[PDB]
Tab-separated table of C-alpha atoms and ligand atoms in Angstrom:
chain	number	residue	atom	x	y	z
A	3810	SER	CA	-57.463	150.676	-105.510
A	3811	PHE	CA	-55.780	149.716	-108.505
A	3812	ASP	CA	-58.093	152.424	-110.351
A	3813	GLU	CA	-56.837	155.358	-108.159
A	3814	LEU	CA	-53.291	154.429	-107.958
A	3815	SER	CA	-53.570	154.563	-111.914
A	3816	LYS	CA	-55.071	157.323	-112.590
A	3817	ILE	CA	-52.170	158.985	-109.980
A	3818	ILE	CA	-49.602	157.279	-111.620
A	3819	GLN	CA	-51.017	159.162	-115.310
A	3820	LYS	CA	-51.742	162.583	-113.596
A	3821	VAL	CA	-47.286	161.965	-112.365
A	3822	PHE	CA	-46.300	160.359	-115.861
A	3823	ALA	CA	-48.097	163.662	-117.965
A	3824	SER	CA	-46.453	166.273	-114.735
A	3825	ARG	CA	-42.781	164.405	-115.256
A	3826	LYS	CA	-43.321	165.156	-119.191
A	3827	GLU	CA	-44.350	168.848	-119.007
A	3828	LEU	CA	-41.283	169.642	-116.842
A	3829	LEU	CA	-39.045	167.883	-118.738
A	3830	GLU	CA	-40.366	168.863	-122.441
A	3831	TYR	CA	-40.035	172.727	-120.798
A	3832	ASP	CA	-36.259	171.975	-119.008
A	3833	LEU	CA	-35.069	170.807	-122.138
A	3834	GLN	CA	-36.622	173.989	-124.184
A	3835	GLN	CA	-34.827	175.928	-121.229
A	3836	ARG	CA	-31.662	173.858	-122.088
A	3837	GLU	CA	-31.736	174.423	-125.755
A	3838	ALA	CA	-32.442	178.380	-125.168
A	3839	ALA	CA	-29.507	178.470	-123.481
A	3840	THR	CA	-27.006	176.620	-125.284
A	3841	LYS	CA	-28.114	178.666	-128.422
A	3842	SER	CA	-26.931	182.291	-127.012
A	3849	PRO	CA	-25.735	169.568	-133.128
A	3850	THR	CA	-27.367	167.864	-135.656
A	3851	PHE	CA	-30.025	164.690	-134.933
A	3852	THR	CA	-30.632	162.080	-137.904
A	3853	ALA	CA	-34.934	161.584	-137.764
A	3854	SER	CA	-34.473	158.056	-135.262
A	3855	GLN	CA	-32.203	159.996	-133.338
A	3856	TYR	CA	-34.640	163.153	-133.016
A	3857	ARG	CA	-37.449	160.266	-131.611
A	3858	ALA	CA	-34.827	158.495	-129.577
A	3859	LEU	CA	-34.145	162.192	-127.865
A	3860	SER	CA	-37.481	163.647	-126.868
A	3861	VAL	CA	-40.624	162.512	-125.017
A	3862	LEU	CA	-42.333	161.360	-127.911
A	3863	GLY	CA	-40.729	157.805	-127.020
A	3864	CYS	CA	-41.469	157.945	-123.663
A	3865	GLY	CA	-44.879	155.933	-122.705
A	3866	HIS	CA	-44.780	152.575	-124.541
A	3867	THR	CA	-42.826	150.360	-122.550
A	3868	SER	CA	-43.976	147.784	-120.114
A	3869	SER	CA	-43.080	146.918	-116.953
A	3870	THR	CA	-40.429	143.647	-116.371
A	3871	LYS	CA	-42.525	142.112	-113.538
A	3872	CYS	CA	-45.640	142.419	-115.145
A	3873	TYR	CA	-48.270	139.216	-115.489
A	3874	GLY	CA	-50.959	140.631	-117.908
A	3875	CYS	CA	-47.997	141.456	-120.593
A	3876	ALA	CA	-46.068	138.157	-119.958
A	3877	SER	CA	-50.093	136.401	-120.472
A	3878	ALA	CA	-49.681	138.504	-124.067
A	3879	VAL	CA	-46.486	137.614	-124.863
A	3880	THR	CA	-47.127	133.437	-124.341
A	3881	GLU	CA	-50.010	133.461	-126.110
A	3882	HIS	CA	-48.355	135.372	-128.804
A	3883	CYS	CA	-46.110	133.054	-129.010
A	3884	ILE	CA	-49.012	130.247	-129.398
A	3885	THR	CA	-50.791	131.908	-132.458
A	3886	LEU	CA	-46.613	132.498	-134.097
A	3887	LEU	CA	-45.867	128.833	-133.202
A	3888	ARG	CA	-49.241	127.751	-134.388
A	3889	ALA	CA	-48.303	129.599	-137.365
A	3890	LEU	CA	-45.078	127.550	-138.456
A	3891	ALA	CA	-45.983	124.049	-137.307
A	3892	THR	CA	-47.787	124.092	-141.019
A	3893	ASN	CA	-44.446	123.706	-142.386
A	3894	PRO	CA	-43.831	119.881	-141.787
A	3895	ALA	CA	-39.909	121.192	-142.039
A	3896	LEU	CA	-40.699	123.422	-139.369
A	3897	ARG	CA	-42.753	121.174	-137.325
A	3898	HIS	CA	-39.430	118.627	-137.102
A	3899	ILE	CA	-37.374	121.015	-136.331
A	3900	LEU	CA	-39.632	122.443	-133.157
A	3901	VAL	CA	-40.667	118.908	-131.963
A	3902	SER	CA	-36.591	118.275	-132.338
A	3903	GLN	CA	-36.373	121.019	-129.731
A	3904	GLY	CA	-38.350	119.487	-127.189
A	3905	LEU	CA	-41.752	121.558	-127.862
A	3906	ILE	CA	-44.296	118.817	-127.063
A	3907	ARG	CA	-43.709	118.416	-123.329
A	3908	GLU	CA	-43.146	121.988	-122.368
A	3909	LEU	CA	-46.802	122.784	-123.830
A	3910	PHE	CA	-47.670	119.686	-122.285
A	3911	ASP	CA	-46.392	120.833	-118.567
A	3912	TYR	CA	-47.223	124.632	-118.595
A	3913	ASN	CA	-49.408	125.623	-121.211
A	3914	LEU	CA	-52.517	122.422	-121.200
A	3915	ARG	CA	-54.217	123.712	-118.253
A	3916	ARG	CA	-53.348	127.550	-117.582
A	3917	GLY	CA	-54.871	130.870	-119.711
A	3918	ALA	CA	-58.528	131.514	-121.308
A	3919	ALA	CA	-60.841	128.409	-121.898
A	3920	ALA	CA	-59.739	129.637	-126.280
A	3921	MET	CA	-55.571	129.662	-125.514
A	3922	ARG	CA	-56.447	126.071	-123.652
A	3923	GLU	CA	-57.921	124.465	-126.600
A	3924	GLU	CA	-55.455	126.388	-128.800
A	3925	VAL	CA	-52.526	124.845	-126.789
A	3926	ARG	CA	-54.129	121.251	-127.779
A	3927	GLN	CA	-54.578	121.781	-131.227
A	3928	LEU	CA	-51.120	123.204	-132.104
A	3929	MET	CA	-49.932	120.000	-129.462
A	3930	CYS	CA	-52.335	117.631	-131.755
A	3931	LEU	CA	-50.930	119.421	-135.085
A	3932	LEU	CA	-47.038	118.924	-133.409
A	3933	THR	CA	-47.790	115.366	-134.052
A	3934	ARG	CA	-49.994	114.978	-137.649
A	3935	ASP	CA	-47.513	112.663	-139.000
A	3936	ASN	CA	-44.517	111.781	-136.924
A	3937	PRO	CA	-44.949	108.101	-134.806
A	3938	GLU	CA	-42.121	109.418	-132.548
A	3939	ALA	CA	-43.728	112.383	-131.518
A	3940	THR	CA	-46.925	110.573	-130.942
A	3941	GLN	CA	-45.710	108.260	-129.422
A	3942	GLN	CA	-43.800	110.597	-126.708
A	3943	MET	CA	-47.400	112.013	-126.118
A	3944	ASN	CA	-49.544	109.207	-125.552
A	3945	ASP	CA	-46.208	108.150	-123.419
A	3946	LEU	CA	-46.735	111.397	-121.078
A	3947	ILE	CA	-50.624	111.311	-121.591
A	3948	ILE	CA	-50.721	107.576	-119.691
A	3949	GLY	CA	-48.050	108.288	-117.038
A	3950	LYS	CA	-49.713	111.256	-115.854
A	3951	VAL	CA	-53.451	108.753	-116.110
A	3952	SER	CA	-51.690	105.759	-114.767
A	3953	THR	CA	-50.312	108.074	-111.661
A	3954	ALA	CA	-53.826	109.633	-110.971
A	3955	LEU	CA	-55.615	106.408	-110.721
A	3956	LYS	CA	-52.677	104.667	-108.683
A	3957	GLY	CA	-53.721	107.268	-105.530
A	3958	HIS	CA	-57.476	108.347	-107.548
A	3959	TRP	CA	-58.907	106.264	-104.244
A	3960	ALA	CA	-57.142	108.099	-101.379
A	3961	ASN	CA	-58.134	111.240	-103.151
A	3962	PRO	CA	-60.280	112.047	-105.989
A	3963	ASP	CA	-59.380	115.451	-106.848
A	3964	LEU	CA	-56.610	113.056	-108.703
A	3965	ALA	CA	-59.477	110.938	-110.928
A	3966	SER	CA	-61.307	114.501	-111.692
A	3967	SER	CA	-58.049	116.152	-112.608
A	3968	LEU	CA	-57.720	114.830	-115.872
A	3969	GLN	CA	-59.871	116.496	-118.212
A	3970	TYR	CA	-57.567	117.852	-120.005
A	3971	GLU	CA	-55.702	115.048	-120.707
A	3972	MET	CA	-58.642	113.075	-122.008
A	3973	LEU	CA	-59.370	116.188	-124.313
A	3974	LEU	CA	-55.898	115.876	-125.654
A	3975	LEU	CA	-56.885	112.581	-126.056
A	3976	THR	CA	-59.949	113.495	-128.011
A	3977	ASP	CA	-58.703	116.039	-130.288
A	3978	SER	CA	-55.778	114.011	-131.345
A	3979	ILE	CA	-57.789	111.104	-132.171
A	3980	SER	CA	-60.825	112.610	-133.758
A	3981	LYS	CA	-58.289	114.158	-136.421
A	3982	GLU	CA	-57.345	111.100	-139.451
B	3810	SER	CA	-88.881	118.701	-105.360
B	3811	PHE	CA	-87.466	117.642	-102.852
B	3812	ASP	CA	-89.863	118.883	-100.469
B	3813	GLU	CA	-92.780	118.298	-102.218
B	3814	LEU	CA	-91.602	114.601	-102.536
B	3815	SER	CA	-90.913	114.964	-98.520
B	3816	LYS	CA	-94.668	116.097	-98.070
B	3817	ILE	CA	-96.152	113.610	-100.290
B	3818	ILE	CA	-94.603	110.576	-99.055
B	3819	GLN	CA	-95.682	111.013	-96.001
B	3820	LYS	CA	-98.974	111.689	-96.990
B	3821	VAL	CA	-99.015	108.238	-98.393
B	3822	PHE	CA	-97.468	106.843	-95.337
B	3823	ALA	CA	-100.393	107.764	-93.256
B	3824	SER	CA	-102.882	106.481	-95.314
B	3825	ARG	CA	-100.872	103.672	-95.660
B	3826	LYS	CA	-100.531	102.850	-92.132
B	3827	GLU	CA	-104.512	103.795	-91.717
B	3828	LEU	CA	-105.953	101.465	-93.741
B	3829	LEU	CA	-103.620	98.867	-92.358
B	3830	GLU	CA	-104.563	99.511	-88.913
B	3831	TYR	CA	-108.257	98.981	-90.256
B	3832	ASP	CA	-107.602	96.202	-91.929
B	3833	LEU	CA	-106.217	94.614	-88.662
B	3834	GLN	CA	-109.284	95.472	-87.051
B	3835	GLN	CA	-111.583	94.105	-89.398
B	3836	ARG	CA	-109.784	90.716	-89.480
B	3837	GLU	CA	-109.745	90.324	-85.779
B	3838	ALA	CA	-113.393	91.485	-85.293
B	3839	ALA	CA	-114.340	88.876	-87.859
B	3840	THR	CA	-112.078	85.946	-86.180
B	3841	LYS	CA	-113.419	86.953	-82.338
B	3842	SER	CA	-116.529	85.413	-83.467
B	3849	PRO	CA	-104.153	83.993	-79.491
B	3850	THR	CA	-101.463	85.388	-76.668
B	3851	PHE	CA	-99.025	88.074	-77.522
B	3852	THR	CA	-96.219	89.163	-75.168
B	3853	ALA	CA	-95.509	93.004	-74.998
B	3854	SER	CA	-92.742	92.714	-76.997
B	3855	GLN	CA	-94.940	90.565	-79.971
B	3856	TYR	CA	-97.264	93.199	-79.847
B	3857	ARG	CA	-95.142	96.353	-80.641
B	3858	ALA	CA	-93.578	93.972	-83.594
B	3859	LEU	CA	-96.913	93.251	-85.038
B	3860	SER	CA	-98.662	97.037	-84.338
B	3861	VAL	CA	-97.918	99.837	-86.536
B	3862	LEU	CA	-96.094	101.323	-83.661
B	3863	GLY	CA	-92.428	99.842	-84.685
B	3864	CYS	CA	-92.941	100.974	-88.391
B	3865	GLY	CA	-91.773	104.429	-89.389
B	3866	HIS	CA	-88.686	104.357	-87.505
B	3867	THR	CA	-85.610	102.773	-90.318
B	3868	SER	CA	-83.782	104.414	-92.572
B	3869	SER	CA	-83.137	103.509	-96.364
B	3870	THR	CA	-80.448	101.163	-96.998
B	3871	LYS	CA	-78.972	103.462	-99.875
B	3872	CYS	CA	-78.418	106.900	-98.147
B	3873	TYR	CA	-75.993	109.113	-98.022
B	3874	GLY	CA	-76.820	111.769	-94.451
B	3875	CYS	CA	-77.280	108.115	-92.919
B	3876	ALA	CA	-74.070	106.676	-93.740
B	3877	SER	CA	-72.457	109.550	-92.440
B	3878	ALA	CA	-73.998	109.986	-89.663
B	3879	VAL	CA	-72.626	106.560	-89.106
B	3880	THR	CA	-69.368	107.659	-89.538
B	3881	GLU	CA	-69.169	110.083	-86.885
B	3882	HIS	CA	-70.999	108.021	-84.476
B	3883	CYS	CA	-67.947	105.468	-85.223
B	3884	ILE	CA	-65.424	108.499	-84.637
B	3885	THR	CA	-66.808	109.679	-81.748
B	3886	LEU	CA	-67.386	105.647	-80.423
B	3887	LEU	CA	-63.573	105.521	-81.012
B	3888	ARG	CA	-62.132	108.458	-79.757
B	3889	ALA	CA	-63.801	107.347	-76.486
B	3890	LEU	CA	-62.111	103.546	-76.916
B	3891	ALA	CA	-58.862	104.935	-77.754
B	3892	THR	CA	-58.469	106.444	-74.454
B	3893	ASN	CA	-56.894	103.295	-73.175
B	3894	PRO	CA	-53.798	102.114	-73.411
B	3895	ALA	CA	-54.901	98.884	-74.106
B	3896	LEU	CA	-57.563	99.357	-76.680
B	3897	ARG	CA	-54.704	101.917	-77.686
B	3898	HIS	CA	-52.660	98.891	-79.299
B	3899	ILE	CA	-55.639	96.718	-79.976
B	3900	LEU	CA	-57.064	99.595	-82.520
B	3901	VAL	CA	-53.512	100.113	-84.364
B	3902	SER	CA	-53.054	96.425	-84.572
B	3903	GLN	CA	-56.876	96.051	-86.704
B	3904	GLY	CA	-54.903	98.722	-88.689
B	3905	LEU	CA	-57.039	102.154	-88.324
B	3906	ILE	CA	-54.148	104.998	-88.989
B	3907	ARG	CA	-54.132	103.505	-92.722
B	3908	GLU	CA	-58.051	104.120	-93.257
B	3909	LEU	CA	-58.785	106.626	-90.954
B	3910	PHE	CA	-55.954	108.914	-92.755
B	3911	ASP	CA	-57.026	107.327	-96.698
B	3912	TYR	CA	-60.500	108.095	-95.652
B	3913	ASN	CA	-61.606	111.009	-93.326
B	3914	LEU	CA	-59.348	113.117	-93.734
B	3915	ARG	CA	-60.872	114.895	-96.083
B	3916	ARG	CA	-64.784	114.534	-95.924
B	3917	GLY	CA	-67.084	115.434	-93.364
B	3918	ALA	CA	-67.619	119.237	-91.907
B	3919	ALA	CA	-64.801	121.039	-90.131
B	3920	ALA	CA	-65.298	119.703	-87.297
B	3921	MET	CA	-64.836	116.112	-88.069
B	3922	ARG	CA	-62.030	116.223	-90.114
B	3923	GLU	CA	-60.923	117.872	-86.959
B	3924	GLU	CA	-62.280	115.304	-84.484
B	3925	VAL	CA	-60.348	112.443	-87.146
B	3926	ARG	CA	-56.808	114.672	-86.977
B	3927	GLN	CA	-57.637	114.529	-83.209
B	3928	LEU	CA	-57.876	110.998	-82.992
B	3929	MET	CA	-55.344	110.045	-85.159
B	3930	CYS	CA	-52.828	111.947	-83.103
B	3931	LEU	CA	-54.033	109.875	-80.217
B	3932	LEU	CA	-53.576	106.541	-81.817
B	3933	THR	CA	-49.859	107.204	-81.555
B	3934	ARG	CA	-49.793	108.964	-78.165
B	3935	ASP	CA	-46.561	106.481	-76.966
B	3936	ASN	CA	-45.962	103.920	-80.174
B	3937	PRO	CA	-42.869	103.951	-81.759
B	3938	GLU	CA	-44.190	101.921	-84.591
B	3939	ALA	CA	-47.575	103.770	-85.298
B	3940	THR	CA	-45.465	107.580	-85.320
B	3941	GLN	CA	-43.560	106.179	-87.967
B	3942	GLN	CA	-46.347	103.988	-89.779
B	3943	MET	CA	-47.986	107.472	-89.476
B	3944	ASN	CA	-44.572	109.346	-90.474
B	3945	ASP	CA	-44.701	107.315	-93.101
B	3946	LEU	CA	-47.844	107.623	-94.779
B	3947	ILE	CA	-47.404	112.306	-94.561
B	3948	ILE	CA	-43.979	112.502	-95.551
B	3949	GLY	CA	-44.866	109.245	-98.675
B	3950	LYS	CA	-48.143	111.524	-100.037
B	3951	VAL	CA	-46.183	114.900	-99.743
B	3952	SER	CA	-42.976	113.803	-101.878
B	3953	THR	CA	-45.337	112.346	-104.139
B	3954	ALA	CA	-47.647	115.347	-105.080
B	3955	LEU	CA	-44.304	117.666	-104.649
B	3956	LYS	CA	-42.335	115.785	-107.596
B	3957	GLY	CA	-45.310	116.669	-109.889
B	3958	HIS	CA	-46.074	119.758	-108.115
B	3959	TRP	CA	-44.212	122.092	-110.742
B	3960	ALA	CA	-46.476	120.285	-113.462
B	3961	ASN	CA	-49.594	120.495	-111.891
B	3962	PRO	CA	-50.110	123.530	-108.829
B	3963	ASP	CA	-53.243	121.398	-107.233
B	3964	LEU	CA	-51.098	118.469	-106.435
B	3965	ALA	CA	-48.728	121.082	-104.230
B	3966	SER	CA	-52.279	123.157	-103.295
B	3967	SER	CA	-54.077	119.497	-101.980
B	3968	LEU	CA	-52.121	118.867	-98.584
B	3969	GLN	CA	-53.008	121.261	-96.427
B	3970	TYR	CA	-54.553	117.998	-94.329
B	3971	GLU	CA	-51.320	116.346	-94.473
B	3972	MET	CA	-49.459	119.257	-92.690
B	3973	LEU	CA	-52.164	120.290	-90.134
B	3974	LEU	CA	-51.895	115.990	-89.077
B	3975	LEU	CA	-48.366	117.031	-88.370
B	3976	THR	CA	-48.679	120.228	-86.814
B	3977	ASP	CA	-51.632	118.686	-84.858
B	3978	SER	CA	-49.026	115.478	-83.523
B	3979	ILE	CA	-46.658	118.104	-83.240
B	3980	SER	CA	-47.972	120.449	-81.084
B	3981	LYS	CA	-49.025	117.658	-78.136
B	3982	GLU	CA	-46.177	116.552	-76.631
C	4001	ZN	ZN1	-48.046	144.891	-118.390
C	4002	ZN	ZN1	-81.441	108.691	-94.252
């Protein structure tokens, strides 16, 4: 159903573009019987029409989150930028949201970024350790009445392993 | 592999039974050249040899839990036995262990038994409601950082629905 919908939507878009181009040409012909700069021509014409994503799109938001993770990983290699980022409160945001969401590669990249953010900062390391210990203790308190609590700590323990493995 | 193992184990058991019977017959023949009662004959002979389950068996423990649930459901229909059972502390045991384990029929039967145990007891109803509310609040506190917490409340809410639906 999605494939048929996409085909029909593309056909409709092509038809709309052709119709609007013809209307613009006819209007210009009627008017010829105003200078535009190079950027204004692109803005007005049909050239800048079909490269914008929908506002409520899951895939596009996922892609933007991937780009944000990549850019933040690049930025964190500067110690001053690392300090500013950890002062923004990025560690808790990455812990609550991006640890468990996305492809496996993205999850490992988020783990690497979280490890890098605490490379030589005792306060950031203490904060991350507090988050991990709190989650593990809260899960282990009710593990006995619900085993999924004990079996849904793999990412916290993986984060601990990754942080320790980097001397 | 399990099927082949079971076949070989059955063959070994049959061979052992034949050998032991022959040894008993030979010993009796040698001794004939002590009265036993009817129950003692069965105890001694090979008749009472192959009807005992292994101590560490998962399926047999599951079956015993099923029988316990059925017997307790039968017993709870007496108000005095119901009061004694709820005084034993059965509601918490059923809530913590048997709500999520077993086949779907067993789970629904456990829900029915838990509903029946609080049929006209304000204290038992308050205890069950406290358990449900506490679990739901604890899960909903960390629902934001972990959605499995929000999606693993189906049995508590089913229990609440079943308890309410019975006037
Ligand atoms: Zn999109
Ligand atoms: Zn068995």
